[PDB]
Amino acid sequence: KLTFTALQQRLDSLMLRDRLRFSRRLHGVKKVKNPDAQQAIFQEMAKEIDQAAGKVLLREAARPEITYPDNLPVSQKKQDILEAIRDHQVVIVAGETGSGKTTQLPKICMELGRGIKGLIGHTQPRRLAARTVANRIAEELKTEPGGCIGYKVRFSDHVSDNTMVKLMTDGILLAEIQQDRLLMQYDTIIIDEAHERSLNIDFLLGYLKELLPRRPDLKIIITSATIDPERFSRHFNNAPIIEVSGRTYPVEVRYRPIVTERDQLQAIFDAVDELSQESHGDILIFMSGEREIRDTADALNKLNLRHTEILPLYARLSNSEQNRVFQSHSGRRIVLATNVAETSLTVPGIKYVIDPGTARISRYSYRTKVQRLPIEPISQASANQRKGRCGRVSEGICIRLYSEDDFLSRPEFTDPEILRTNLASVILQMTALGLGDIAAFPFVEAPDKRNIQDGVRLLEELGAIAYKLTPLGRQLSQLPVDPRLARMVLEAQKHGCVREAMIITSALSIQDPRERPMDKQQASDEKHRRFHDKESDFLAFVNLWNYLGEQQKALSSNAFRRLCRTDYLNYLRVREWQDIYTQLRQVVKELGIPVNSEPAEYREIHIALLTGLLSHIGMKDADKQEYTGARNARFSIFPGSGLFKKPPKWVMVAELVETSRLWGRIAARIDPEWVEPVAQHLIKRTYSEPHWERAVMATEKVTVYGLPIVAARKVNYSQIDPALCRELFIRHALVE
């Protein structure tokens, strides 16, 4: 015979994912009335459970022989770590450079008996990094891709049933929460490179803590660089931290700071020449954007240096191209990369690095209430990670294109991305992943609660949204820019002005490329006046863009930088502009949105913009002076705006900034009739003074955040109040 309880024990020896389905089936047998049928269904279930328990034994028998490296970088602490993991649910393993933590910790778990009933999940910030770690561990254990080591880098990829160790990015593990909130597929979860503290890492660290009581079988550990490993231990109730001494051989630091003919890449050039005098070792150059990488790879190729291969490492590269970065390379290789190179996976034989000390960093402007991508000086922690890529027995040199006092003036750490992102994006994204309510989320670092209600409001103004995510909210969270700007891009689909909108919203995401220095004020101002538009500051963005692309075709790359210096345009930000515009154009086309070919008209582009700035409308006084904005707030146009001298009745501004007073930056003239269709979710209709006219007519007043887009329009009042119009109609129709 078979009993209900008898088969529950068989479940405790199953893979976790298979337990729930059998559990639901066993309970359903309680309905069956015929006892012969119950035992009949029990026997078949027991034969199905036997196969499932056979899968565990098969996986447990196919465990390979675990080997640890001869170099003993962490292998001495490997004996120490196996003691740490087995005893505590949460262990934090701090490391430095290529200590071998990333590749041995799944092995350490596998040897501890883990990975059998659940998967050993291991996250990485980048698709490439995750794929190489898997290939790294698979060869060390002599395992082919179908074997016990796999990786998943695209949400539509899958791994074999023989997989014992799964490697993915953070975004994938988040995507998997949606369809597996208990995360039953894993019995171990390794979070790598947690020192970066992006949104996906913080979302994952918060959610795992929320999950840990519901999953006492789950053991999780957090690998990181030595950047404040203590805070993670405070996040969980208690958490033992282990510090691994990464053996780094000495690196020499040379500070080479720089202060109309000079080239921007000239500092870069002289630094590689300096390194050339020392040796022909491989050089790694960290840079800001992909176009800057292109512009440098082109300039280093025109130099025709001796026996040197210039390898620009973009994200768009094929996997066949990234494998080339690890090839034998007979001659010298100069690798040009961005922060992607700051990840644990390194180019094998790098001897020197060149660090401009600057990086494009997502940060919310409290002053102008927008999320921007400013280029700014990296932190000491980031800079020491860049220099840490010289790690090798051979002596290496790091050249820092800035003064030593500069490096010591910079802040010690980079702000975690949660503390420099506007909450609307934070809300919009955890809503899209199902992370729930923000306040109840156990953030490792909490945001500011005052901005929580201000984020909800903006998502509500933007039609993006506890709460639910409208379909355009889903589209909104797939866009790299600020939600206000993201909304304009989507609306441009309807008006056929997507090119213009992608130009403008990428332009408004960066610090203005149009420089104005004190010595050259009249000349820079004269130059910028070429693109100004009569009725829209925004059109100056489209004018300059069409021009910079016109000369980019006509001129060589060298003569282009020369033009920037001549036309007073910060070259670095002109390149960031194109970089963002392109990254924007990729997500846009991943969605069904077309991109135009003909210039859109003034009304078509500005209605699209308007959907993002509905709270930024204003109407002018009759005193020929100030404006009235949302919520009875008043402001004035920023001097230097194209509209400043002929301000219109209805204005639309990109920025409300309060210094001496509240000013409006980047203005454009609108027609208040445009506001009505894109405002249905916010308008407040008001009626007054109904009268019988030869039905009953009333006067309608429409307001958005208190402003009168429709002052008074005669309408038929029969729908708004049936009773009154019925009464009045009877008297007049009879008297008629």
Side-chain angles (χ1 to χ4, degrees), residues 363-375:
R363 185 184 307 282
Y364 175 73
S365 176
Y366 285 96
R367 190 185 200 169
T368 69
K369 272 183 58 175
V370 292
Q371 191 84 38
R372 301 154 94 237
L373 297 172
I375 312 270

Side-chain angles (χ1 to χ4, degrees), residues 21 36 69 135 143 189 217 228 260 327 355 359 377 385 395 403 514 583 606 634 655 688 706 721 727:
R21 55 167 183 177
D36 259 4
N135 299 345
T143 282
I189 294 191
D217 52 331
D228 196 341
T260 179
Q327 297 315 321
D355 168 42
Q385 299 316 118
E395 300 172 347
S403 103
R514 294 173 287 180
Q583 172 180 358
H606 284 85
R634 334 219 321 117
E655 291 162 24
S688 282
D721 188 340
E727 296 172 351

Side-chain angles (χ1 to χ4, degrees), residues 141-364:
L141 298 175
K142 309 177 179 182
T143 282
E144 53 191 24
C148 77
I149 304 291
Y151 62 85
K152 176 182 180 185
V153 301
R154 134 181 43 242
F155 180 56
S156 303
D157 286 355
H158 265 253
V159 301
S160 73
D161 299 337
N162 329 291
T163 303
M164 193 165 308
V165 174
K166 187 179 186 173
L167 264 150
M168 60 205 128
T169 63
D170 349 310
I172 306 304
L173 189 55
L174 293 168
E176 295 185 351
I177 298 181
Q178 222 183 3
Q179 304 92 24
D180 190 30
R181 302 194 58 84
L182 284 157
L183 288 174
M184 286 298 187
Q185 35 178 331
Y186 313 110
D187 75 333
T188 35
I189 294 191
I190 291 157
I191 315 287
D192 225 321
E193 317 286 56
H195 58 267
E196 294 198 354
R197 295 218 44 197
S198 61
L199 297 168
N200 302 33
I201 279 112
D202 290 349
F203 289 161
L204 270 160
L205 291 181
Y207 186 87
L208 286 176
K209 179 175 178 180
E210 201 167 42
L211 190 74
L212 275 190
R214 301 180 232 145
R215 287 288 319 279
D217 52 331
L218 180 62
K219 294 182 183 174
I220 88 103
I221 63 184
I222 303 148
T223 84
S224 70
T226 197
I227 289 91
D228 196 341
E230 164 174 16
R231 178 185 302 276
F232 297 152
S233 181
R234 296 178 295 172
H235 178 55
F236 306 95
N237 264 268
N238 291 314
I241 57 163
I242 310 300
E243 286 172 330
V244 172
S245 49
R247 300 179 179 182
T248 304
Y249 285 90
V251 186
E252 178 192 347
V253 173
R254 293 174 185 175
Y255 292 91
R256 295 298 131 86
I258 48 178
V259 161
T260 179
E261 292 293 297
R262 207 205 83 199
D263 191 308
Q264 297 84 354
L265 314 186
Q266 194 55 51
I268 313 283
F269 295 171
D270 307 4
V272 323
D273 183 68
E274 167 157 2
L275 295 174
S276 276
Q277 320 306 323
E278 292 280 336
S279 164
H280 215 47
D282 277 0
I283 314 173
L284 174 54
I285 313 189
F286 293 87
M287 302 193 195
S288 56
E290 303 217 314
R291 307 252 166 154
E292 196 196 5
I293 296 181
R294 277 186 256 268
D295 264 22
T296 44
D298 177 79
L300 293 177
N301 278 328
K302 305 306 172 55
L303 273 166
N304 273 322
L305 300 179
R306 292 169 174 159
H307 306 90
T308 297
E309 182 182 22
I310 288 92
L311 214 44
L313 175 54
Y314 320 93
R316 297 182 192 174
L317 285 192
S318 303
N319 308 346
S320 53
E321 306 279 20
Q322 294 138 18
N323 304 334
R324 186 177 174 174
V325 183
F326 292 86
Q327 297 315 321
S328 163
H329 73 82
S330 56
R332 164 169 85 169
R333 242 176 206 166
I334 298 180
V335 181
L336 320 184
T338 44
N339 300 29
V340 176
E342 300 186 51
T343 311
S344 58
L345 174 77
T346 55
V347 197
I350 292 293
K351 186 173 181 62
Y352 306 139
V353 291
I354 286 167
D355 168 42
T358 66
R360 174 180 119 209
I361 185 170
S362 180
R363 185 184 307 282
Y364 175 73

Side-chain angles (χ1 to χ4, degrees), residues 403-547:
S403 103
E404 187 180 24
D405 312 85
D406 189 332
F407 166 95
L408 297 178
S409 74
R410 282 131 126 110
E412 194 142 342
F413 308 96
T414 50
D415 295 332
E417 197 189 1
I418 183 65
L419 294 174
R420 54 182 156 75
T421 311
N422 75 312
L423 296 201
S425 292
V426 188
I427 293 164
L428 179 53
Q429 266 196 5
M430 51 199 297
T431 318
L433 306 168
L435 296 178
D437 182 69
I438 170 172
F441 199 81
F443 291 103
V444 191
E445 186 64 46
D448 202 10
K449 305 176 295 190
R450 290 180 171 177
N451 312 121
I452 289 185
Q453 274 73 66
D454 292 359
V456 182
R457 281 178 234 265
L458 185 61
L459 301 183
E460 283 171 359
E461 171 203 326
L462 289 171
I465 65 180
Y467 308 143
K468 299 178 177 179
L469 206 36
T470 81
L472 79 123
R474 308 297 302 265
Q475 302 197 296
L476 220 74
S477 67
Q478 296 274 293
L479 284 175
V481 293
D482 185 81
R484 276 200 185 278
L485 313 162
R487 183 57 172 84
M488 328 187 185
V489 189
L490 297 182
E491 187 83 8
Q493 174 171 18
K494 314 175 187 174
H495 305 79
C497 67
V498 164
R499 186 193 193 260
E500 287 79 10
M502 275 181 308
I503 292 159
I504 285 163
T505 58
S506 71
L508 294 166
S509 300
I510 63 177
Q511 328 185 255
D512 205 324
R514 294 173 287 180
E515 286 176 339
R516 172 178 153 271
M518 205 170 326
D519 259 7
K520 300 288 203 177
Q521 295 175 180
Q522 291 81 332
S524 54
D525 278 337
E526 176 202 35
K527 282 293 180 178
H528 302 319
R529 286 174 187 188
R530 295 170 302 175
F531 320 93
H532 277 174
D533 182 274
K534 171 168 61 88
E535 290 211 325
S536 171
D537 288 354
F538 303 82
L539 281 190
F541 291 132
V542 184
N543 292 4
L544 174 58
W545 173 276
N546 302 328
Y547 162 83

